[PDB]
Design an enzyme around this catalytic site. Structure first.
Site, mmCIF file in Angstrom:
data_model
loop_
_atom_site.group_PDB
_atom_site.id
_atom_site.type_symbol
_atom_site.label_atom_id
_atom_site.label_comp_id
_atom_site.label_asym_id
_atom_site.label_seq_id
_atom_site.Cartn_x
_atom_site.Cartn_y
_atom_site.Cartn_z
ATOM 1 N N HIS A 1 0.634 -1.285 -0.139
ATOM 2 C CA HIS A 1 0.094 0.085 -0.032
ATOM 3 C C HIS A 1 0.902 1.279 0.001
ATOM 4 C CE1 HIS A 1 0.795 0.793 4.059
ATOM 5 N NE2 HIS A 1 0.734 -0.387 4.483
ATOM 6 N N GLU B 1 -1.155 -6.475 7.875
ATOM 7 C CA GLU B 1 0.202 -6.590 8.407
ATOM 8 C C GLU B 1 0.209 -7.406 9.511
ATOM 9 O OE1 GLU B 1 3.380 -4.804 7.334
ATOM 10 O OE2 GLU B 1 3.444 -6.892 8.565
#
Lengths: 170, 171, 170, 171
Positions: free
Chosen positions: A8, A74
Site C-alpha cells: 500500500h 500486516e
C-alpha cells in the site's frame, strides 16, 4: 500461479519510522498519488485486499474493487504499534531483522502471522492482485529465497510458489 | 492442467444484445450449426457441462455426454436478466466492462461467480472439455491476463492456472 | 520458446498412401479447406514455411506470409518418392517405424534429415509458426519424448526444447 | 531473460499520424515530459538504445547512458517514410495491421526488421533496459502472442523469449 503483491501507499508512520500493523492509518497525499500510479501497471486480475484502510484505498485508487480478507493484514504489533524503529529494544530489532522469534505483548507472533498469510495464499484458486502490506510482501519474498523489502506503493509479481516474476518500483 | 472451454452456440439474445444468465434459452438454428462444427475439432477427453439447455445441447451436438454441474453456469444476472446491454445503467456497464464490483439485485456478485467457477476448476483431477458460457470463459481468460471475449460456439484451451494455449474459432 | 508445428493440408498421395517428400504436389480441395480452417486457430507469430507448394499454400490460406526455408522440407525419399507404403520393402518400413537407419538411393538419410531440421530449430530467435511436413513434426515430437504422428492440416505447439504445449486436430 | 523495452516519447508525427521510421525527428515538449516521468520508474540495469535522436533523448531524460545500436531502430519505411497512415494504400495498411508481408520500396521488409531485432535480443547476455520504438515493442509483444501497441513514453518488461511480465504507462 501468478500473484501480484502490492504494498500500500505511504502513511505518516512511514516517514516517521514507526511500526505500523493493525493501527488503521490513512494514506498521505503522496500515498494516494502512489496508488493512482499503479493503475497504469497492474493487470486486471481478480483482486483481494487487506481490510485495513490504507490497503483498501490503494486498491480503489489503483482501479480495483477487491474482496476483503483480514488474513492479508500486516502483523499485529500489539503494544509495539506506533513504536519508533530506532528505539526498539535490540531483541525486537534483531528478531525482525532475522524474521524469527518476534511475539510482542498484545500482538501476533511472527510465526502465527506467517501461518495466516500462507494459509490464505494456498487457498487462492486463480491468479490475483493482492493489496497488502510490507510484512506480507516480505514473508512471501523470503519464502521464495529473495530479500523481502519493497517500497510503499510498489509491487512484486510472483509465480507462486516457484519464483519471482518481476519487481515494479516507481 | 489442460482444459478446453467451449462457449455454447448462439441464442436469440446474442443478436439482440440482452444479458443472458440463468434464463434458459434454446440454441438458434445457427447455434446448433456452430455446435455441430465443433464435433471432431475438440479432443476426446472427459466432459463437463453447465446444466443450462444451450450448453447441454452444444455438448450433445459436439459429440459428448457430459456430467452436468450448475457450477459451470453463466453468472446469475438477477433482475438484470434479459436487460438490453445498450440501456444498462452506467454503473452496471462499467462494472461488467471492467469485470469488477458487480452485484445485481436478486443475482450473483462477480466475486461469488469467480469463486464458484474457480473452485470448480480447482477440483478437476485431469484434462477435460468444459461446455460453458461466455462469462465463464471470460473470467478464466481475464484471470490469465488476456482479453476474455470469444465468439459463440468457439473454444479455448488453457493450461490452468498458468496460461492460454490456443483459441479456436470455426466459420 | 513457443513454436507451432503445422502439417500441411492433404494431397492426393495422402489418400493413395504414397511416400511424399520433395515431390512438389499441390493440395487437394480438402487440403485447401483444412488450411483455411487453421486461420481461426493459429496465433499471429512470425511465420516460416517449407518452400514446397503444399506448405506454402497452407500458410497462405491460413492467413500467413512466411519466410521460406528449404530446411523445413520433408525428408527427400529419393527413388522412393511416390512409393506405396504398403509395398515398401520390410527393411524400409522397419526403419521408418523405428525412425532410424533409413537412407534411400538418391535421397537423404534420416540422420541428415534430422540434422537439417534441428539446425533450423536451434537457429530460431523468437516464437514462430512453422508450416512444414509430417516427418518434420514427427522428428520434433519424438525429440520431446512423444509419439510424432499428426493428421494433415493439424498442428502441435511446443515449448522448445522442453515439452509439448497442446495439439490441435480439427 | 528480463528485458525492459521503452517506447520513446512522442514526436510531432504521432499526433499527425505519419509513418515514422528512420526520419530523425526530435521529441515534442510532451515527449520530453514523458521521458522525464520514466526516471525512477525503470530498473537500474545496463542500457541500450536506438541511435535515433528521439530514443537517445528519451534514454538521457530517463537517467540512463545507453550504448547505441542501430539494430534497435524502428523499421525503415523507405519511400513510405512520412506517409499519412490514413492515405496508405490498402496493401500496405493490411500488411502493417496484420504485421506480415511488408516490403516498402527503398526500405526494410518486416521479415528483415524482425530478424534484426530478434538477433539483437538473442545477443543480450543479461537483463537490460532497451530504449527503442513502437514497431520494435510491437514485434516483441506480437511474437509473445499479445497485442503490441503501447503508448509513447511507456514501457514493457518481458522474460524473453517466453512471456510478457508487465506493461507500464504513466500519466
Amino acid at each position: 500461479m501468478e500473484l501480484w503483491l502490492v504494498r500500500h501507499g505511504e502513511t505518516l508512520w512511514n516517514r516517521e519510522g514507526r511500526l505500523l500493523g493493525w493501527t488503521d492509518l490513512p494514506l498521505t497525499a503522496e500515498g494516494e498519488a502512489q496508488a493512482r500510479r499503479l493503475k497504469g501497471a497492474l493487470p486486471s486480475l481478480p483482486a483481494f485486499s487487506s481490510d485495513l484502510l490504507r490497503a483498501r484505498r490503494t486498491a480503489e485508487l489503483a482501479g480495483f474493487s477487491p474482496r476483503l480478507y483480514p488474513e492479508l493484514r500486516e502483523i499485529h504489533f500489539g503494544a509495539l504499534e506506533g513504536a519508533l524503529w530506532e528505539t526498539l529494544d535490540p531483541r525486537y530489532k534483531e528478531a525482525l531483522l532475522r524474521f524469527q522469534g518476534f511475539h510482542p505483548p498484545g500482538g501476533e507472533s511472527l510465526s502465527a502471522f506467517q501461518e495466516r498469510v500462507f494459509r490464505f495464499l494456498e487457498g487462492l484458486k486463480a491468479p490475483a492482485v493482492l493489496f497488502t502490506h510490507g510484512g506480507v510482501v516480505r514473508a512471501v519474498l523470503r519464502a521464495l529465497g529473495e530479500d523481502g523489502l519493497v517500497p510503499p506503493g510498489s509491487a512484486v509479481a510472483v509465480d507462486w510458489p516457484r519464483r519471482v516474476l518481476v519487481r515494479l518500483a516507481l
